[PDB]
Design a protein around this ligand. Structure first.
Ligand code: STE
Ligand code: STE
Ligand code: CL
Ligand code: CL
Ligand code: K
Ligand code: K
Lengths: 259, 41, 259
């Protein structure tokens, strides 16, 4: 008939000890161990809001003095949350963003603000009065600095199945000449666009404004553990480290025989 | 029609069409008026 | 269960004619036609012995004057059998070889002869007395010129499934420089070795000897008909033709309107 023949790892509580791997090298007693493992579930480890951005709109100075700012969404500028995330290679999750806004010294004034999510390809505001603030399709939040911090849920938005903290490659084909090495490690699947903020008015606001953005990871999944960062972070988009001062992971001592 | 002009594999495609329902396309608040009542002018 | 879904043409007698393709364009009668098709069966067409070699061992002259001859078996030197065979691309068959031997004028004398089949790789006789005539493994026939013609059956011996009259290629890899174009069309699967003949004696025979070899194809199979040779043959191993005198396949006449 056929012409060709060739054609869960961690349970809810800690393991008990039975009376005589401890009970393998030493004599043991029985211990009814009911210590929980829930707090080390990745969800509890990650679902804690952490700082991911500090945006300023001063009234004086040489930057963002026009009452609006387009902040390219890049969550790798703060060491604490970054190191936790980088314990894994890939992570998938929804996120809760909270916007804590105040003047530079922490005082609050009755000032109306608008935060708009500008996905990749949507036109960015070019002034406090730009037509883009009409926000007929993009999601916007109007809130006062005297209101409690604004807060919204952002779903998992990557074109890929998970965000990836490490992408060993280039975004496109071509020669990869020295002049473009900045391309290395750049994963467009993590590029979520712009976050735009403005004081709501055609006239300039007399208040300097500082916005602290916190992100809380939720409904998280993680894949492929990796060694934890042991050198200070230098740049947002690469793992460069200071070659002249390579830190040892552990503190030192004089002799291997004395504490 | 791919599987008509080229040889295809089976793809169990579960991509949702909900976000393009006109309700989701339109039910987003947008600016329709700016009214001013200045004290001078 | 499966992760990937994508993974006889001519009868014994001539057709009859039925009373009304003749009976399609003209009115016909019934003809009970019992004309046989047997004589055109390839076996009857081919199983007729034909000349394939004429070997001479003169006593005087400048060739084969030592009472022995090593004849490289190449059956394409005689036009009649060659053209019939070349009607096909591949042919498989056994063969009956008959050896008609006499002096140059047809007279017969009491002379003992030996014919030995020397397959490719067997040592060839280098004299009338060579050790190879011991013929301890090769097949030999000892016969007198006064006996009836010697005759033997040779089986189908090619390493391939059929002999091939046309091989569009080269026997080996390599550059194929102009100096070696003789290689083109050479099929080793048809190369059956050597046919060796000698007068049986350490002393020279006073008789000039002419051997005519006839081959009768039998138990034949043939594949892929091709246009029949329409130019005189020039060489044994290629279809070269005389370019300055290309023969028309049909005779000519003065006008297309008169016979
Ligand atoms: C209406 C106001 C809401 C706007 C909130 C800002 C939304 C920003 C997009 C959220 C993307 C979260 C995934 C981040 C993946 C990390 C990318 C990176 O920094 O390399
Ligand atoms: C004992 C004496 C018997 C020797 C008889 C000669 C045998 C020659 C070998 C027969 C081979 C027949 C196949 C020929 C195929 C055609 C090859 C060619 O000429 O291109
Ligand atoms: Cl507006
Ligand atoms: Cl001998
Ligand atoms: K237990
Ligand atoms: K018939």
């Amino acid at each position: 008939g056929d012409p060709i023949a060739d054609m869960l790892q961690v349970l809810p509580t800690a393991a008990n000890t039975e009376a005589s791997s401890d009970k393998n090298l030493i004599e043991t007693r029985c211990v009814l161990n009911h210590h929980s493992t829930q707090e080390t579930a990745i969800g509890n480890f990650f679902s804690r809001a952490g700082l991911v951005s500090i945006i300023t709109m001063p009234t004086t100075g040489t930057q963002n003095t026009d009452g609006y700012v387009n902040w390219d969404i890049d969550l790798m500028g703060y060491a604490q949350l970054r190191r936790k995330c980088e314990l894994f290679t890939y992570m998938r999750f929804d996120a809760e963003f909270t916007f804590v806004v105040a003047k530079p010294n922490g005082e609050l004034v009755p000032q109306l603000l608008q935060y708009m999510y500008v996905p990749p390809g949507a036109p960015k505001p070019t002034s406090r009065d730009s037509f883009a603030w009409q926000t007929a399709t993009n999601p916007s939040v109007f809130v006062k600095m005297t209101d409690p911090p604004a807060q919204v849920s952002v779903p998992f938005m990557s074109p890929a199945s998970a965000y990836q903290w490490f992408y060993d490659g280039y975004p496109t084909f071509g020669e990869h000449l020295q002049a473009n090495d900045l391309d290395y490690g750049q994963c467009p699947n993590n590029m979520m666009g712009t976050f735009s903020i403005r004081t709501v008015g055609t006239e300039k606001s007399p208040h300097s404004i500082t916005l602290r953005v916190y992100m809380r990871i939720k409904h998280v999944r993680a894949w492929i553990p990796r060694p934890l960062r042991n050198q200070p972070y230098l740049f947002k988009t690469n793992p460069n480290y200071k070659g002249n001062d390579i830190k040892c992971t552990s503190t030192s001592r004089d002799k291997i025989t004395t504490l």
